[PDB]
């Protein structure tokens, strides 16, 4: 039912777990997760993935 050749790039997942997730919760917000303690201001900052 989801055989998309080249990958269906519509199914997502939070690769970078910012913190622990409360049961049944759902977060929908895109923001660069800084790993070098620097102001991302977008994606320009270092380690802002």
């Amino acid at each position, epitope marked *: *039912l*989801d055989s998309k*050749v080249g990958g269906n790039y519509n199914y997502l997942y939070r690769l970078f777990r910012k913190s622990n997730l409360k049961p049944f919760e759902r977060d929908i917000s895109t923001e660069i997760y800084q790993a070098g303690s620097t102001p991302c201001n977008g994606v320009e900052g270092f380690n802002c993935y």
Partner: antibody
Amino acid sequence: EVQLVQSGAEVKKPGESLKISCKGSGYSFTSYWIGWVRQMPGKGLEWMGIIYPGDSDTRYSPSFQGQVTISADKSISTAYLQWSSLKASDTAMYYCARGVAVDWYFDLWGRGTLVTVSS
Amino acid sequence: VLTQPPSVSGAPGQRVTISCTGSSSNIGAGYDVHWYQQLPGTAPKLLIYGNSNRPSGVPDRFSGSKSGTSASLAITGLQAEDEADYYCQSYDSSLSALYVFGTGTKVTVL
């Protein structure tokens, strides 16, 4: 080449079977949604079902359940259309076209079977 | 299930939007819309899919778009080969059926 060929024109009576070979090539057969679509003469396209050669998984249609027979042969990578009993009004063209999961469209269509069936 | 104008007329060199007006589960639900070029006397040929993508062999004069609950196929510079029939179709979650096809839009060149 990627081509889905059909059978020739046939005239016959309701009740008997009509077998159609729609050979598939140029793509991984067990990885694409192969299916049949029917069109009445001078009308629109109506969906019958799509079958997956990996598991013979068939999702038929509300208005076309219990009326037609579908199957596939992954041994020869050919799609099979069969009928347990035809009808006089069943004179219409049937197309075997391969779709893809997600976005659910036929990327390629077969030539189609022009079949005339009457009493 | 997808209603469409039975006959759409277009002069050569004119741009017309083939209105794919649908319900709240076929177009308005955010689902993607696809078009097939039912050339008369033959089998339909894929012309627009994904509302923005164009397959190999489709000229750029062919185009597609989505407008809320309706979709439009923009065709620019109608020629003799453009006399063809179009079925917009999409996916319906509520009817269980993977595939739902439009009523159709016969296109004639004036």
